[PDB]
Amino acid sequence: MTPILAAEALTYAFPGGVKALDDLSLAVPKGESLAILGPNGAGKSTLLLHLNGTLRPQSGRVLLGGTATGHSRKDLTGWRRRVGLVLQDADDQLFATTVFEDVSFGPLNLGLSEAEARARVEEALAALSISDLRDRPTHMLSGGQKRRVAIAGAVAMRPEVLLLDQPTAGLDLAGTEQLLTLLRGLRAAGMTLVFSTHDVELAAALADRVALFRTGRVLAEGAAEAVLSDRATLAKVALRPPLVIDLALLARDHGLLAPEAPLPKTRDALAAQMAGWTRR
Amino acid sequence: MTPILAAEALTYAFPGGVKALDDLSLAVPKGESLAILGPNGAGKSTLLLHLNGTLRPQSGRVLLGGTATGHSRKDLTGWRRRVGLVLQDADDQLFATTVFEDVSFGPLNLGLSEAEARARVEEALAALSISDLRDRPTHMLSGGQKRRVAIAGAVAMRPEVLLLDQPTAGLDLAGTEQLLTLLRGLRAAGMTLVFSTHDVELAAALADRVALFRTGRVLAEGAAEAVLSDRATLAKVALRPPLVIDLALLARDHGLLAPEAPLPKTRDALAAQMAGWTRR
Numbered sequence: 001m002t003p004i005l006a007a008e009a010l011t012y013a014f015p016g017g018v019k020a021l022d023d024l025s026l027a028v029p030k031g032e033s034l035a036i037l038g039p040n041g042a043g044k045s046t047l048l049l050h051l052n053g054t055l056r057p058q059s060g061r062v063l064l065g066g067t068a069t070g071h072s073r074k075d076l077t078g079w080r081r082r083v084g085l086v087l088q089d090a091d092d093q094l095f096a097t098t099v100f101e102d103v104s105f106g107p108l109n110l111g112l113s114e115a116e117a118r119a120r121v122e123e124a125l126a127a128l129s130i131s132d133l134r135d136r137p138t139h140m141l142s143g144g145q146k147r148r149v150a151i152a153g154a155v156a157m158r159p160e161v162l163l164l165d166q167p168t169a170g171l172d173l174a175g176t177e178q179l180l181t182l183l184r185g186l187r188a189a190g191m192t193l194v195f196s197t198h199d200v201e202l203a204a205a206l207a208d209r210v211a212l213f214r215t216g217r218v219l220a221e222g223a224a225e226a227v228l229s230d231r232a233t234l235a236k237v238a239l240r241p242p243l244v245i246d247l248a249l250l251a252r253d254h255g256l257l258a259p260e261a262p263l264p265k266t267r268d269a270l271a272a273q274m275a276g277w278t279r280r
Numbered sequence: 281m282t283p284i285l286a287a288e289a290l291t292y293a294f295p296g297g298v299k300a301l302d303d304l305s306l307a308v309p310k311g312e313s314l315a316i317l318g319p320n321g322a323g324k325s326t327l328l329l330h331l332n333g334t335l336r337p338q339s340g341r342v343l344l345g346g347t348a349t350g351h352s353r354k355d356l357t358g359w360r361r362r363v364g365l366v367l368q369d370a371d372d373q374l375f376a377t378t379v380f381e382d383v384s385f386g387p388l389n390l391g392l393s394e395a396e397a398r399a400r401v402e403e404a405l406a407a408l409s410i411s412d413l414r415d416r417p418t419h420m421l422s423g424g425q426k427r428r429v430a431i432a433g434a435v436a437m438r439p440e441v442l443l444l445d446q447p448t449a450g451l452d453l454a455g456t457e458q459l460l461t462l463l464r465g466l467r468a469a470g471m472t473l474v475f476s477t478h479d480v481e482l483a484a485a486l487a488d489r490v491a492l493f494r495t496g497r498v499l500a501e502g503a504a505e506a507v508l509s510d511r512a513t514l515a516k517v518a519l520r521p522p523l524v525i526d527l528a529l530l531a532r533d534h535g536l537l538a539p540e541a542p543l544p545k546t547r548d549a550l551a552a553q554m555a556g557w558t559r560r
């Protein structure tokens with residue numbers, strides 16, 4: 001059970017000297033969904049860019065399938081086929097073409113025939129509800145529409161690992177729920193997911209494991225439920241628990257539960273508890 | 281007349297023909313905080329770009345202080361000084377220079393002294409905890425840091441009206457709380473706020489009024505608590521009440537809230553009410 005991806009002791013400063021990763025290590029079990037959380041500037045984006053080989057560290061290394069990645073053209077090509085990335089700014093990921101052309105580029109560049117590439121593209125467009133935008137120039141789109149196009153282009157590649165940098169920023173509710181359904185489906189099909197987010201509710205909905213970043217290091221890592229219900233540890237990266245868990249931890253302290261009972265984590269669970277409560 | 285801004289019957293299609301605003305009317309009372317919500321592509325950004333005179337409609341008009349604006353160079357300059365806009369994409373708003381210089385340009389272009397400009401810059405940077413980035417090149421920043429710099433540049437100009445296009449996208453929790461504090465202070469000083477967002481919790485925390493956009497038109501507008509608790513109307517733009525408000529409504533359903541008090545509209549407010557609950 002070697003992880004599919006492992007960051008080992010990554011240290012990276014940008015040209016110009018700004019330090020971004022400081023001895024960062026993080027292992028990603030195959031088939032898991034890993035949420036990465038932490039403050040602006042903690043190094044989440046830079047870490048994702050190391051995991052698909054966009055950036056190379058000054059020290060440390062990334063392992064893919066248990067082996068050090070290698071830095072050749074064939075190496076990097078194989079690496080990027082296996083590990084896809086949806087950038088934080090979707091506009092940076094788009095080409096000056098129509099939506100269909102944009103999403104087609106990847107599968108075609110994979111040396112796929114016209115037919116298998118076509119099927120990939122059509123399914124990706126449908127999965128993100130942008131089929132009707134196929135002939136739209138990518139610049140003639142709203143921010144949330146652009147986000148869908150960028151995600152569709154990545155998913156059309158069917159990578160072994162999908163990295164997403166703040167995938168739901170700017171998405172409307174319908175789009176967020178549709179993306180959740182898609183990502184759950186891809187995971188069920190065996191895909192590994194790593195996503196940065198400031199949405200702790202998204203982490204709660206999608207992650208098996210959670211890593212908290214601060215100042216270029218992993219401050220804490222564990223199963224999603226254990227980390228997301230830990231008020232003191234989350235506070236060290238200036239986060240609160242997901243709202244229902246937040247309140248429900250408060251309820252447990254206040255003596256509203258049992259005691260002996262499990263913590264309500266859903267709206268439904270909390271609603272059921274409320275019927276046994278009154279005002280003082 | 282009385283509202284500080286009024287969109288009257290705005291119709292706009294982009295070059296190339298994509299329709300964006302469809303006979304849209306929206307009035308903004310001076311001093312209010314207005315949230316604009318609605319699906320990706322609904323026309324939220326396009327409307328904001330009409331309100332500060334960036335885009336000119338094919339039909340309809342914008343009134344500023346009850347007066348039709350006009351489109352001369354000097355009309356536009358005066359309009360933009362009175363109505364600032366934080367763009368949806370921070371990179372579109374940042375100059376290729378240091379953070380301090382970027383934020384200083386607005387005040388300096390207003391004809392203020394270097395001493396006044398300096399004070400405005402330092403106040404804006406400190407409000408969003410980025411004083412220590414003053415000499416950082418704006419490209420050498422994370423997405424959330426860039427968001428803070430763009431907001432700082434707009435608030436340093438101290439406009440009559442501040443428009444914010446999805447200002448918390450990519451922002452961490454601390455940044456969001458600091459933005460709320462900043463915006464509350466600016467409004468107390470008399471500033472009018474209009475913000476587009478997909479974060480309905482932000483709307484709950486910050487808005488006096490909420491407008492719901494659908495396919496280029498205002499579907500509904502009203503007092504924030506009324507709109508954000510209106511399950512039926514929210515469903516028409518594929519929204520639900522914010523989780524805090526859902527839980528507050530749920531609490532009221534079980535009589536756990538103030539006979540007649542306004543709903544808790546923030547996590548802290550909901551948590552406070554919890555202190556007064558006991559088991560049956």
Ligand SMILES: Nc1ncnc2c1ncn2[C@@H]1O[C@H](COP(=O)(O)OP(=O)(O)CP(=O)(O)O)[C@@H](O)[C@H]1O
Pocket residue numbers: 139140141142143144145170294295296298299300318319320321322323324325326327
């Ligand atoms: N530069 C551009 N050229 C052409 N059409 C554009 C455009 N920018 C946006 N559009 C189109 O104009 C309409 C309104 O887009 P707008 O960006 O105002 O929506 P919005 O701000 O509500 C969406 P989002 O929440 O996704 O940011 C949509 O149909 C969109 O595809």
Ligand SMILES: Nc1ncnc2c1ncn2[C@@H]1O[C@H](COP(=O)(O)OP(=O)(O)CP(=O)(O)O)[C@@H](O)[C@H]1O
Pocket residue numbers: 014015016018019020038039040041042043044045046047088419420421422423424425450452
């Ligand atoms: N292109 C660039 N050049 C130089 N420094 C950069 C940079 N992009 C980011 N940085 C810096 O690198 C560090 C890590 O930033 P990174 O963008 O990886 O973090 P992050 O993704 O956790 C933040 P966010 O939540 O704001 O998107 C910060 O100190 C940031 O200012």
Ligand SMILES: [Mg+2]
Pocket residue numbers: 044045088165422423424
């Ligand atoms: Mg980032």
Ligand SMILES: [Mg+2]
Pocket residue numbers: 142143144324325326368
């Ligand atoms: Mg927009």
